[PDB]
Paper text:
In contrast, no hook currents were observed for the highest-affinity blocker NpTx-8. For NpTx-8 and PhTx-74, the extracellular end of the density had a bulky cap, which likely represents averaged conformations of the blockers hydrophobic head, while its intracellular region included four prongs, likely representing four different orientations of the positively charged polyamine tail. The bulky hydrophobic heads of NpTx-8 and PhTx-74 occupy the central cavity, while their polyamine tails stretch nearly the entire length of the selectivity filter. Based on the four-pronged cryo-EM densities corresponding to NpTx-8 and PhTx-74, the polyamine tails of these blockers do not align with the pore axis but instead lean towards the selectivity filter walls adopting one of four nearly identical positions in the pseudo-4-fold symmetrical ion channel. Specifically, NpTx-8 formed stable hydrogen bonds in the selectivity filter with the backbone carbonyl of S624, the side chain of Q622, and the carbonyl oxygen of Q621 in an asymmetric fashion. NpTx-8 also retained a hydrogen bond with the E625 side chain at the intracellular pore entrance. The pose of NpTx-8 was asymmetric, favoring the entropy of binding to the highly degenerate binding site in the ~4-fold symmetrical homotetrameric ion channel. Among the four simulated structures, NpTx-8 formed the most extensive network of contacts with [name], corroborating its highest potency.
Kainate receptors (KARs) are a subtype of ionotropic glutamate receptor (iGluR) channels, a superfamily of ligand-gated ion channels which mediate the majority of excitatory neurotransmission in the central nervous system. Kainate receptors (KARs) are tetrameric ion channels that belong to the family of ionotropic glutamate receptors (iGluRs). Four TMDs form a cation-selective ion channel, composed of the M1, M3, and M4 transmembrane helices and a re-entrant M2-loop between M1 and M3. We find that blockers reside inside the [name] ion channel pore, intracellular to the closed M3 helix bundle-crossing gate, with their hydrophobic heads filling the central cavity and positively charged polyamine tails spanning the selectivity filter.
Numbering used by the authors:
A (entry chain D), B (entry chain C), C (entry chain B), D (entry chain A): 429 to 874
The structure:
Amino acid sequence: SNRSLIVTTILEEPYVLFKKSDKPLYGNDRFEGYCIDLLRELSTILGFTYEIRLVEDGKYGAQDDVNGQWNGMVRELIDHKADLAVAPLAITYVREKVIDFSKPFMTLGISILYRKPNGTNPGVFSFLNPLSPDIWMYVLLACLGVSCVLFVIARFSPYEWYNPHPCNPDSDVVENNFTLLNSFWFGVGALMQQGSELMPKALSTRIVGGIWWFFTLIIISSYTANLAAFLTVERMESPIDSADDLAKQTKIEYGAVEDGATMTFFKKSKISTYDKMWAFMSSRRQSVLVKSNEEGIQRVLTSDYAFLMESTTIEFVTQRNCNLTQIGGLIDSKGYGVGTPMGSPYRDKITIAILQLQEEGKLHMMKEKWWRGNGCPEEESKEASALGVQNIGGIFIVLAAGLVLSVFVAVGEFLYKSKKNAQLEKRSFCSAMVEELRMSLKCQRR
Amino acid sequence: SNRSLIVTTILEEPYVLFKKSDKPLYGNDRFEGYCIDLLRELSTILGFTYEIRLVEDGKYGAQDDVNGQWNGMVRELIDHKADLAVAPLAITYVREKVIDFSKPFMTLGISILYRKPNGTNPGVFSFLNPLSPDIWMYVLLACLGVSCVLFVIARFSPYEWYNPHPCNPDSDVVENNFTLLNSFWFGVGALMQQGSELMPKALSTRIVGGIWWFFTLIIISSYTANLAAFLTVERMESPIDSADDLAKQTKIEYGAVEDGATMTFFKKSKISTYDKMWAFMSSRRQSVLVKSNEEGIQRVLTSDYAFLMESTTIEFVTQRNCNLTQIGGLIDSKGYGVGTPMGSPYRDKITIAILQLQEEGKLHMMKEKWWRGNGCPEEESKEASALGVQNIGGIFIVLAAGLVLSVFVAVGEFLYKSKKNAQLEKRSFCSAMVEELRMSLKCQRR
Amino acid sequence: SNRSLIVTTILEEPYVLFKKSDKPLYGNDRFEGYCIDLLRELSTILGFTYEIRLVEDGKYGAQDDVNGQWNGMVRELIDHKADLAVAPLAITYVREKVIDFSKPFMTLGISILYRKPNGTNPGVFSFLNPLSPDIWMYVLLACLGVSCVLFVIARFSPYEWYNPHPCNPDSDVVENNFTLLNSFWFGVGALMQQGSELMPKALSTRIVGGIWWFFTLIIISSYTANLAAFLTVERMESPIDSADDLAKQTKIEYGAVEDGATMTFFKKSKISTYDKMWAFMSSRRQSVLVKSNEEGIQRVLTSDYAFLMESTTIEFVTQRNCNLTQIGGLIDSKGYGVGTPMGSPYRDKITIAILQLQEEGKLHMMKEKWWRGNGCPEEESKEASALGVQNIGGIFIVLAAGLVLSVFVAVGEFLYKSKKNAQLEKRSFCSAMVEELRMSLKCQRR
Amino acid sequence: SNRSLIVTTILEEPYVLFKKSDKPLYGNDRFEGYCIDLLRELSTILGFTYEIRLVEDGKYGAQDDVNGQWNGMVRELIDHKADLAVAPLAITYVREKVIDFSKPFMTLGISILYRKPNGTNPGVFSFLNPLSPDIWMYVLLACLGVSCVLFVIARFSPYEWYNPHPCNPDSDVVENNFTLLNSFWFGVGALMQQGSELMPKALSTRIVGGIWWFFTLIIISSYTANLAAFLTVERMESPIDSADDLAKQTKIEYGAVEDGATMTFFKKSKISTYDKMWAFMSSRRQSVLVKSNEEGIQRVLTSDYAFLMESTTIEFVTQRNCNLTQIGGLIDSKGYGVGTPMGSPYRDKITIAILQLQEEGKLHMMKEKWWRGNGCPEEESKEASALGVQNIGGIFIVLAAGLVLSVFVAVGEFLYKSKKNAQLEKRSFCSAMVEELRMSLKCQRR
Ligand SMILES: CCCCCCCC/C=C/CCCCCCCC(=O)O[C@@H](COC(=O)CCCCCCCCCCCCCCC)COP(=O)([O-])OCC[N+](C)(C)C
Ligand SMILES: CCCCCCCC/C=C/CCCCCCCC(=O)O[C@@H](COC(=O)CCCCCCCCCCCCCCC)COP(=O)([O-])OCC[N+](C)(C)C
Ligand SMILES: CCCCCCCC/C=C\CCCCCCCC(=O)O[C@@H](COC(=O)CCCCCCCCCCCCCCC)COP(=O)([O-])OCC[N+](C)(C)C
Ligand SMILES: *[C@@H]1O[C@H](CO)[C@@H](O[C@@H]2O[C@H](CO)[C@@H](O)[C@H](O)[C@H]2NC(C)=O)[C@H](O)[C@H]1NC(C)=O
Ligand SMILES: O=S1(=O)NCN(C2CC2)c2ccc(F)cc21
Ligand SMILES: O=S1(=O)NCN(C2CC2)c2ccc(F)cc21
Ligand SMILES: O=S1(=O)NCN(C2CC2)c2ccc(F)cc21
Ligand SMILES: O=S1(=O)NCN(C2CC2)c2ccc(F)cc21
């Protein structure tokens, strides 16, 4: 009970922050957080007393590189104007050459912030998904396949060659409804569940028409059922999944705090994925390198952007906001340790104490208390939105594309018939003008 | 007539009341309720005259650590001023160190108030939901757009002008089937999947019809698959059935009475489901922790609120309001017993007296007299997920709206023909008289 | 530490049973269960010692009614050849007139065993469920309604009266395809998504045919989508829900242990629901009154049967087996109390101790340890079975019913035409025999 | 050359090995692995000659309460026989009271082995699943049954025999369109929802066709709605993603190594999710608690088993077998550090040496050399729920089976006509030669 320990500590949520009460001027119950509850139960097992003191500089600790002078909390650890440094103070090779750390109470690393997938614009078509792109092409090869087979069988079968003119049938003239043009019009019209004016007689052609109807009915039933599975159970998917999946895409842009501890890892890196990721953000400096953590969260939240901070700050923000999520595992491995001056016997005593706190399972109980906030279980039994112009939206393009295609066929049939009239009339001009008159007669017969 | 014993209660209903009548100078006849009928039937089989005396404080009992003493009824019993605390005095641990109970007369626990689930509001025209109102208009404008294109293409195309009357070679006639009215009827018929009496015969008009068929195949499939998504996710909507269901729940807020025995249970609770319920309450103890029981009942009404109180006071106000419903079982387990001073010779005679009334079935009858009144019809079907008139409903209105509209057109077709029939022969009225009788020949031909 | 307490105890799972180990002959760690863990922590707070002793009779305790001699455990509580009776010993008015109980450590009551619903035979039709029985009748009234409206409009419209014989049309004869027979065949054929040979001209009749197609397309889309909601999310429902819902149905039969503590409640009852339930099982004695608990569980499991035992034994068996479930709440209210001789000071000390064990929340931790076994969470995302003959199964009846109905119409048309021939030929015999010859010509023309 | 320090390991791979070669009389060159490369690079930057010496016991270290002493490496360090326990010696609480660690060189935890999800076996002909094989046969027998009834009814009915050739009044002809072949083609066409070229005209045959239409409307709806149920519930099948997912899970059993640090964590655990995992293990500790790590790997293969061991030994054997997959994150948090005797002057020089290798990026490179080899292709698409050739598949086979069957019928129709054509004029072969050239006129008429 001699010389009560001066704990230096910086303010950062959820580690150490003030308590939301009016109730002024009492002190040392003024703070509340993760690094207060851990520090509380260190003096439960050990024996020491407080005066938690905020750092008078507002930094952690770094090099000045002009005189070697230190800053932050670890400047107070050297000249003994502090005793402990229970705070987010990561263990660093530069730091422990002048102070001493305890064994870590939290494990962390560099990870990725990115917006959670939304499903607002699934694609302008987005209806073509319940069948595979192989299957969408294999049914067009089935339509062109069956109709060529149905054309050959209808020509080489005797009972399809029937007697036309069902008004006075007594003759020798024999026609055939299945041309090549009429054979695709069967296979398209049977596919689209609509039927046609022509229906096969002559059982060899009815087996083709019978088995094409059963092929059709499974396709539309499989398309309707699988689309009913998509719209019921929305399973979203992110574009990115890891660092190498983000090291390739150029549309997303990277991001870290300028002159932070995260970009120092990418500058000093040698791994071929992260050497590419630094060459991105070194050339694009003053565009993707933000100057603070809270400003970098906004650029994920406003623009299309990814952010590289520590994993513990990601695990705190993604429990608060539901816009955001974590992408991939951990890149680096670092640890928060209790700062301690050189030679002090309180290093090994807290080192024993943290392992005592861990085997009982209290740090997991501390972490679940301060990082779990309101919680985001918002994914449930998805509230069904109607199909909109962003959802189906693309059958209106292919409808307009078919109508524009058909006008060019209509002019192509307007000229091919007039060229056939040009075999019986003059060159190009008079046969086309008389043909335009028949629509300007505006009548029904002739 | 040994001592004319003095018995203390607290004015809580249904337990004790004032007998609602005029004409004062009552004795112990001014009281009624559950504990008055319990005190009566305990007096008949044990032989003692009771004099009812309300406690001066009005509190049940608790230790104030200022004086280390009790208040209310348990202070009235330790001072030997009155025995027989026949009241809602719950048997808890700290209250039996001071006084002696009997065995309980009312099984009890902590449960959850919540509002009875109102509505779900399916409404008329709820079939119109799986497509947005932009889509229902755009499909309607597509059917009035494609049929205006197919009218123009089939008029300009030469190959649509074919030879009718399938006799009489080449017949000096040509004919266009696709008029203006016949082209809307193609587009409407293809929209409702049932093909019309006429199909295109030229490749220009078979691309318009062929791409309108693919448009309508997606529209009917997207309507059916989304309606299979709306009806599935509202079949998976389960209401709140337990306190564990409230654990993940965030929108509907919890509640308790301030410094009552209910929130006292949550402070001492080691259950992780119940400790998360206190993590809600220890933070936000200004908007959900309400002051009185009657205030929290009003909070369940005009909020999204779930109040936590004793099971008897839940199951009483659910009998008085059809807007409320107990959800969940019983969280705690406790019971009301009568109160006697420490070392009294009466708690054994009452325990045998209470068990005698339980074997006879009195306590189940003595509840229901003061418990249930004007039993609610409750509207309990709740398996009405079978698309009744409440669900689908509106397609019987628009069918009736279409059949009334068609009668107005049938009169308009009757007048327009009879006006043209009176253009040459008849004047105005005798044309309409012979035409109404023309259609009343009850025959098949002419 | 004088005269170590002789605890009498009967064997019943999960309260007290032997431990599954080979390891013979050590004693008093030999037993393990609920009433061992509670009894363990009674001697943690109090001070006393064991020799747990099994009862030498294998009963709880009852009357002989020929000499008043007791049996079971409570026979040993009277003559002091026991000290405690930590066991499932329910508090009874007959029992406490000779011994003393502590305050209860478990609350229980009479409840209902019954088989969990299965969904194996949902009904032989079972396809008629996604539309309400109002809606199934309202579409037949729509078919008969529209076709009568479509018949009247097609007669009273001029443009429907068109020129027949499209082979040489130059005449004055005018026919009409819409008869009364042909008008139902439109409305049936449009309902069944099949079309017909006849298609309306004359726009007033096309508005009827247009709006009937849109009515049809919503019905089949609503039927397919809601059936896709049933088969995805199976929501089972029991026939019975409470005692009064079981006091009405005769197909289920009741059940309790003969000369048990449960049927004594129904014999002595006065409530109008349970007086009816006793008149069932008093007249049907030796048929529904079983002689043991384990034999009564089998009759629920083999036959269609309900069983009336205590709620704690229901809460133990229904955690073991997934065939079984609990129906309704609790009928009676009883309690397990620690037996104690008269005047013994260990009654009030354990009474304080049980309330000490309860406020800390340990009996809930004891009960969740011994009643939760493997657990039955087996309801999940139901593994879809194909539609079988037990599932759809009833369209094969109405198909055969329609074909048998049509043969009687075919004979009715065979006679009505022959009666029309009988107006031109003789009475009944020769016109019917010549008409039978034309099918025996076995040809196609004439 | 100060002392030529002695360093103790344990033969566990990848950490230390034997260098696989012939030619004995090695020194410390007979070892290789992770901790040999760590000991090398710690020797280069700190300047000490190491002599590797395997520990005599082979155990890591634990207290036997018989003697209260340690064994294995931590006994080798307290006795000052050798320093530098460069080995998988995890930093735990009881091991640092005896010896001193450095700061960790490998982040570690407890995770879950589980077999990689094999198959899901969609197979060819999986479209045939939403109806049972009784139903696919009965619908086929219904189409061959109704069409045999409709052949008999339309032959016997007088009203079906109508006048063909719609000119020439009454024409001395009658005609039945419904032959045997034309009646199957009605029933097949109505089955596949696309109406044929002929419809019934009598009320007897319009009830057969009218009730066959209602039969097929239910069959196509029941096929589509069940297929929307199969494809939904296998889209809701999420694999096991956490230990909390194993908590409700019952079929796939847990596992651990006997008396290891993994099950030691579950005994001390106060987490209700992890305590339920020990409720599995404390009962069934003969079938799931296995003796060695290599035995439990074989249990994951040939069982439904989930083994619990350290995260490094999971992530090593998943690199060696493509049949295995780590599921879940990290349950525990712990780490390997090198071991030094209590109060050694080397643990500070090693901690700076370990942090120097972490800043350079050595420890991420020193893993991957001894960690990853022959990287697995992993078959990772896993969003193939879009009905590919694996899913639907088989309707392309039966379409191809129908088109090959129709060619055999077309030859049979060609021979049966040419045999009847050779019944009167030609003999056998020149009839077939002029008929093949009859169909090769490449025209539309004759
Ligand atoms: C009467 C029936 C006669 C059928 C004869 C057909 C002619 C010959 C055609 C040959 C086609 C050759 C090209 C495709 C190759 C097929 C062979 C094959 O791959 O094996 C397939 C199985 O075999 C089947 O399942 C075939 C099913 C055909 C049924 C369709 C009949 C159409 C009737 C139309 C009626 C129209 C009615 C409507 C009009 C009124 C798939 O096998 P696998 O999975 O790859 O491996 C097998 C291993 N295993 C055995 C352990 C599982
Ligand atoms: C161009 C359109 C002209 C329509 C005139 C129809 C004639 C007149 C017919 C009268 C029918 C009388 C009997 C039924 C009673 C209906 C009135 C009623 O109940 O109100 C309903 C609303 O009103 C509607 O929404 C009606 C919708 C009609 C649309 C159908 C047009 C058919 C076009 C055919 C084209 C075929 C094309 C195919 C062929 C080519 C329901 O209201 P509520 O819920 O009970 O309470 C209202 C309270 N609130 C206001 C706050 C919500
Ligand atoms: C003659 C028979 C023809 C059969 C063709 C078979 C189909 C094969 C065709 C294409 C095969 C698939 C290839 C992939 C497409 C490439 C990308 C693409 O073009 O997408 C484009 C649309 O896509 C279309 O427009 C294609 C449809 C053309 C109309 C087909 C009509 C035929 C109807 C058959 C009738 C049968 C009658 C039978 C008569 C006997 C989208 O690109 P975008 O417009 O730039 O996006 C703008 C988005 N924005 C506005 C939001 C900015
Ligand atoms: C069921 O009816 C009640 C009472 O009409 C609705 O309660 C309203 O709740 C809102 C939300 O707090 C209040 O602002 C209103 O004052 C309440 N009373 C009204 C509108 O009279 C309740 O919302 C209904 N249930 C549902 C699901 O809508
Ligand atoms: O700064 S440390 O004490 N030493 C280095 N390491 C390792 C990456 C293995 C780690 C890994 C996780 C920590 F929490 C601490 C440390
Ligand atoms: O205060 S008690 O007499 N003893 C403690 N408990 C129970 C644990 C069941 C209960 C439960 C219900 C009661 F009515 C009384 C009591
Ligand atoms: O046998 S008791 O001690 N006294 C009577 N009752 C009551 C039904 C009120 C109850 C109710 C529940 C119990 F657990 C015990 C008893
Ligand atoms: O044995 S330690 O040095 N101290 C305790 N823990 C932590 C819970 C953070 C960890 C976690 C990961 C490690 F690598 C080392 C340790």
